[PDB]
Amino acid sequence: FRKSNLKPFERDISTEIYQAGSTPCNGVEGFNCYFPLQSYGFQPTNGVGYQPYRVVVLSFELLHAPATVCGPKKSTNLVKNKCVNFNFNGLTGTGVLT
Amino acid sequence: GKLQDVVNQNAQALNTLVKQLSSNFGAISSVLNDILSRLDPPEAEVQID
Amino acid sequence: ISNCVADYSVLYNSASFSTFKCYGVSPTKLNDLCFTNVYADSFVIRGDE
Amino acid sequence: ISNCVADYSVLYNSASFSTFKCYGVSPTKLNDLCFTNVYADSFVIRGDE
Amino acid sequence: YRRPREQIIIGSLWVFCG
Amino acid sequence: YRRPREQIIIGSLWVFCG
Ligand SMILES: *[C@@H]1O[C@H](CO)[C@@H](O[C@@H]2O[C@H](CO)[C@@H](O)[C@H](O)[C@H]2NC(C)=O)[C@H](O)[C@H]1NC(C)=O
């Protein structure tokens, strides 16, 4: 139960009772006042549609800052005054380094 | 000013054309190299188009 | 996640994950790509969701 | 019930009904929703039933 | 919040705000 | 009776038959 949809990448912890009805809840559940949180039900005999899935979401971003997270690619020597394909922390391109 | 305005207008047109190279136009980035180096060809075709 | 060398290829071929869907990047191509930060959000979700 | 204007807000806020359960629709969201036909079935049911 | 494209090169515009 | 989804969008497929 919530008043409006979440903005992207937003987290909510407040457990205030939703006042869906016109009657004020006054902080206590009852008529038209439901607990905002609900408990899952997971059993070893539950169906695949109800089986609990452990999920992870990975997000990447670059903020023109030092490239802290990189890959296992091995760096090579430095070449100057030659038309080469450079790759500086992902700055993929071609040109002459002088 | 009659001679200088022609040069100014041509320079403005060229500057606008150059600035137009840094627009997403709906893609994920304005740099073609980033699109080529991040996405596989089938997904990169849409951004390139 | 920051200031560490990553390896997404092993996560890709581990074959222990039911769903591996990436948006805006190619599973086999971010292996040689660099980012400033990586955020990992974890939770448990029902099968139909 | 058809070809008329309904009012579910007063029914929800009447506070005279012991049980108000909605399946497949939000009780506070169908006020701005329109339906072609409305069926009303009424009878007497035991307390335990 | 929504952040400008100038400050983010690869990532999504939206950032954590909860 | 039961009706196909092509005729009913919001309501239940089952219709009155008594
Ligand atoms: C950081 O702390 C401030 C101070 O508590 C928080 O500001 C409060 O936010 C709540 C809900 O957003 C309001 O009801 C309060 O009136 C605000 N002020 C105070 C003094 O409590 C702020 O939300 C916190 N931000 C984060 C991200 O935790």
Side-chain angles (χ1 to χ4, degrees), chain A residues 1-2 4-72 74-98, chain B, chain C, chain D, chain E, chain F:
Chain A
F1 292 74
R2 211 180 185 279
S4 72
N5 282 19
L6 300 193
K7 306 169 78 169
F9 279 140
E10 190 166 28
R11 204 207 298 140
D12 198 2
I13 314 292
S14 64
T15 179
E16 197 154 52
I17 305 303
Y18 190 36
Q19 315 92 0
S22 65
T23 58
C25 294
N26 311 327
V28 295
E29 81 291 332
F31 180 69
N32 302 357
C33 297
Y34 321 92
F35 200 70
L37 277 296
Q38 258 68 35
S39 186
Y40 265 118
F42 293 134
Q43 292 80 241
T45 56
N46 278 6
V48 56
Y50 282 84
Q51 275 172 22
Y53 273 134
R54 200 167 271 210
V55 297
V56 177
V57 169
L58 282 171
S59 181
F60 319 98
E61 68 178 4
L62 179 84
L63 318 181
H64 53 50
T68 69
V69 190
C70 281
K74 300 287 97 175
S75 60
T76 185
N77 306 349
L78 175 74
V79 176
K80 289 176 182 167
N81 307 89
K82 287 179 59 178
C83 171
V84 298
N85 308 311
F86 45 74
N87 188 345
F88 292 99
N89 309 318
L91 187 61
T92 309
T94 187
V96 174
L97 308 172
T98 61
Chain B
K2 291 198 62 162
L3 293 185
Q4 203 56 43
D5 283 345
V6 184
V7 194
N8 296 348
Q9 278 151 15
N10 283 258
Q12 272 186 328
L14 277 171
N15 290 354
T16 309
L17 187 68
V18 163
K19 285 188 290 179
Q20 284 291 128
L21 277 163
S22 78
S23 301
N24 319 294
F25 294 123
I28 52 175
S29 176
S30 70
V31 177
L32 186 63
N33 285 342
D34 275 355
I35 282 164
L36 284 170
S37 69
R38 277 162 48 177
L39 296 172
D40 51 35
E43 290 177 80
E45 291 206 330
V46 179
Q47 323 296 317
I48 286 190
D49 263 8
Chain C
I1 315 291
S2 281
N3 271 0
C4 62
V5 62
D7 189 3
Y8 321 101
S9 77
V10 294
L11 293 180
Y12 193 50
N13 52 337
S14 186
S16 175
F17 309 89
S18 176
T19 307
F20 204 110
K21 301 200 74 159
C22 300
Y23 313 84
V25 75
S26 168
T28 184
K29 185 182 286 185
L30 75 164
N31 195 348
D32 48 22
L33 191 59
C34 287
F35 315 106
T36 49
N37 294 327
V38 175
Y39 309 91
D41 312 321
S42 305
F43 40 87
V44 189
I45 281 293
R46 204 184 72 248
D48 286 334
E49 193 71 16
Chain D
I1 310 295
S2 281
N3 277 358
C4 52
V5 58
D7 196 2
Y8 322 112
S9 75
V10 287
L11 297 179
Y12 186 50
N13 304 318
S14 186
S16 178
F17 312 120
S18 178
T19 306
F20 192 92
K21 292 194 73 163
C22 298
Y23 304 84
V25 67
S26 163
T28 183
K29 204 180 290 183
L30 73 165
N31 194 5
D32 47 23
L33 215 48
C34 297
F35 302 109
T36 52
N37 292 339
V38 180
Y39 306 94
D41 307 325
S42 308
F43 42 89
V44 182
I45 283 297
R46 203 182 67 249
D48 285 335
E49 197 73 21
Chain E
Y1 320 98
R2 204 221 300 280
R3 298 273 159 249
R5 175 42 81 191
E6 290 86 299
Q7 319 296 134
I8 297 85
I9 297 89
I10 300 182
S12 43
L13 293 179
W14 297 85
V15 293
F16 175 79
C17 73
Chain F
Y1 320 99
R2 174 199 268 281
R3 300 272 151 248
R5 195 57 83 180
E6 296 89 298
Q7 314 293 325
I8 296 90
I9 294 92
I10 289 287
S12 49
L13 296 185
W14 298 99
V15 295
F16 176 74
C17 65

